[PDB]
Amino acid sequence: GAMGSMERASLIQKAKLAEQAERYEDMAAFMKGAVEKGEELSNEERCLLSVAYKNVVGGQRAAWRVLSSIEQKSNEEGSEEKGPEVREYREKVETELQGVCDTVLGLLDSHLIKEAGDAESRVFYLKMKGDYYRYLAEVATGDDKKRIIDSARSAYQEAMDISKKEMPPTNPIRLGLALNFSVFHYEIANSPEEAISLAKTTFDEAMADLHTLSEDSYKDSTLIMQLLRDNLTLWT
């Protein structure tokens, strides 16, 4: 790895600089190097890893959607044949996206998840596993598509099971997991009723637990609750 010679602490420091500079590819490379040092990550370090790759793959997803839309329109009847270029370039972006997802999934499997024993680390990583299999499912068309979808579901479900046993219903990791698993149900699994039921129950159980929180914890929890409500409004 090109980061193998750089100190762990220096990689983390540079990831934070890259975040301030909005250089998310560099941020992700620095955090990959940090993970590959082999030590467990702290809460803040897990957030740097997740922010970096979320921004990288989020830009790839947005570009893939633009290209896929152009490709779909080029394939409608009455459209002039423009050659293989749109499909080729969509495939190029898709392969780079799949490469990033494979890299994140590889860090989770070697060896972040197996060393994560506390609920806040293990739920976080299993959420990330569900998310990156979900991004693979968004572009998947082959023999393995059902298995990709089921890999996302399985990771999300294990995270859910731990979070319900070990975390309060307002915990922001538990909330963000539920938000994303609900989106999985709606957009990937063709299960809009499960998506809506999960978002609603998550929102209501968090509401009833807000009274236990400090002002700062309240802000964190209500921020994600608003996203759950925003999705519910979109879907109903």
Partner: peptide, 5 residues
């Protein structure tokens, strides 16, 4: 698109 974090 729907919200995710």
């Amino acid at each position: 698109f729907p919200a995710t974090v």
